[PDB]
Amino acid sequence: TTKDVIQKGISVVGDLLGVVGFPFGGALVSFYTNFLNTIWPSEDPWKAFMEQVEALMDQKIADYAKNKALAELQGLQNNVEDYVSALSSWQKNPVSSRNPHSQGRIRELFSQAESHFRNSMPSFAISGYEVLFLTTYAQAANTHLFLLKDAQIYGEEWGYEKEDIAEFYKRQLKLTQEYTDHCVKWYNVGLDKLRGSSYESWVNFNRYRREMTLTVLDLIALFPLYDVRLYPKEVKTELTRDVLTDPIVGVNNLRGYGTTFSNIENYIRKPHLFDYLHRIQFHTRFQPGYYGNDSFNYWSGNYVSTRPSIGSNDIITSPFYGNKSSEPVQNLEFNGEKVYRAVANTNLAVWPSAVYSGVTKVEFSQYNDQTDEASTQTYDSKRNVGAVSWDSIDQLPPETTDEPLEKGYSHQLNYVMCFLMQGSRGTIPVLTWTHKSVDFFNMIDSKKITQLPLVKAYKLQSGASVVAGPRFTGGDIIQCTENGSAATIYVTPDVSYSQKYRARIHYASTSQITFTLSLDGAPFNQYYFDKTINKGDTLTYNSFNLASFSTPFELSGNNLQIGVTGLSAGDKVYIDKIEFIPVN
């Protein structure tokens, strides 16, 4: 269900993570001609973004409104196309071309496009349909910002005056805040409009939350990296959040025997440090069928093990989920492997009184970065497997379908839960996946700006917990409630010529505070940081400030430990990311 927008939704975030920050000008047109075919070739990509949010909501956009949202996304096609053609010429054309004629021509093109976005946008926010338009609003907003930054890059070359540029800069700032906050507000509103009580309500809920994460929340997460003044190099970053695929079922209609809403959501992975899949212990049962044929074996329960982010290796293993095994147990080991796909068989037995569905087979496609070669590891119920009915590609497509899927995939499996049906009529398993952009090693690039999310810390102290991020950070954040050391993340430098660095940190504090950075316990950076919220406040874009440390430093260590002081009682610090700016 939905691979049309959910593919364009992952190509755009997968394509935008290269030209994010200050793109080496050659990659900024190597991007924009992918983005003109992904999101702006016709109005076929824009009438799908609508009918996707419509499907998750069971409500309609009227017809006196579903049009003027397409009449504008045509308006914006040309503009954006025409600007990119012009900009591409500008890039190629040797500087013995840059006469006053072509200057004010690209100038007018950029001004056209940017002008038009500013006129269009409220069309994607009309009162009453803000949720249904959300993806359209997002993809547009994202083209508008990504457009606006070009004024900073080429402004002088095109002959815009100091003011002209600086007026664009203030607009990019205000719109980055307004666009982001709009998207979180209305995402949550829609999400809430879908909580219910049945397994049925839940799958719609989760399908909304998955698809909105891929085609909205992942997109806004990159909006502050279009500020090329604050990010004047290329940025190395990652999305740390979870997504759960739809559950694996042998029937469309479970007739109210699916696990209740409360029984799934209150029991899925709560905000946690980042980890990677380590082990799955499959548990198979026997399903006596109506005849000496349909009787089969089904995946009924499991354990899960996951290995924590780098710095620790002492593993985690889950409670038992589901029912214990009546055939022998199967173990697959996933150390060092990245499970870029999952395909599954299901099967059912029709009984005069009831139906019994199960998952009989799951084949796990996987890849290996330590030693470049792809493989498969499979699970077999060992009795009447049936046919494949569930393909994770249909929900987590690849970034691009150019390369083979083990290079161009978009997600790797993180976690496998097993939920029991009502009146043990089966087990429904649920798969959790993370983004391919995550780096196991926590590498600090030597040419680029590096963003290290505090959820990649391997260890938390002084009563520092992991908290639901505010939807625009790309994941969660660390919550400090106490003075003293709060988080410890392991860190991989890429050279050993003493490459000096400056640090910034992206936080939100209720009071003024002091951050201490250390390496292997040696403290190497401290400074005072400004208040940014009042107690009780709900965290919007402006809640988080991004502030530099005074002193350059080298990465002669691996164990970054972050500490907070200044908290009175009832204070909160929220830490999102730590940044590394390579220096001279």
Author numbering: 61 to 644
Sentences from the paper on this structure:
We have been exploring the use of Cry3Aa protein crystals produced in Bacillus thuringiensis (Bt) for multiple applications. The unique biological self-assembly properties of the Cry3Aa protein enable the direct immobilization of functional proteins by genetic fusion or the entrapment of co-expressed protein targets within the Cry3Aa lattice in a fashion that stabilizes the immobilized protein against thermal and solvent denaturation. Here, we report the generation of mechano-responsive PEI-modified Cry3Aa protein crystals and their use for NADH recycling over multiple reaction cycles. We have developed a mechanoresponsive polyethylenimine-modified Cry3Aa (PEI-3A) crystal that enables the versatile and long-term recycling of NADH in an approach that is simple to operate.
Given that the more positively charged Pos3Aa crystals bound NADH better than Cry3Aa crystals (11.2 ± 0.7 and 6 ± 2 μmol/g, respectively), we decided to explore the use of protein cationization to improve NADH binding by incorporating the highly positively charged and flexible PEI polymer into the crystal. PEI-3A crystals were produced by incubating Cry3Aa crystals with PEI in the presence of EDC/NHS. To elucidate the impact of PEI-cationization on the structure of the Cry3Aa crystals, we took advantage of the fact that in vitro-produced Cry3Aa crystals have the same space group and unit cell as the crystals produced in Bt. SEM and X-ray crystallographic analyses of the in vitro-grown Cry3Aa crystals revealed that the crystal framework was unaffected by PEI-modification. The crystal structure also gave no evidence of an ordered PEI monomer or specific residue for PEI attachment, suggesting that, while the PEI molecules bind to the Asp and Glu residues within the nanochannels of the crystal, they are anchored randomly. Similar to what was observed with the Cry3Aa crystals produced in vivo, confocal microscopy confirmed the labeling of PEI and binding of NADH throughout the in vitro-grown PEI-Cry3Aa crystals. As expected, while the original Cry3Aa crystals had a zeta potential of −35 mV, PEI-modification led to a change to +45 mV. Notably, PEI-cationization of Cry3Aa crystals was highly effective in promoting high levels of NADH binding (540 ± 6 μmol/g) —an amount that we hypothesized should be sufficient for facilitating NADH-dependent enzyme reactions. We speculate that the nanochannels of the Cry3Aa crystals and the nature of the interior of the channel provide an optimal environment for the binding of PEI and, subsequently, NADH.
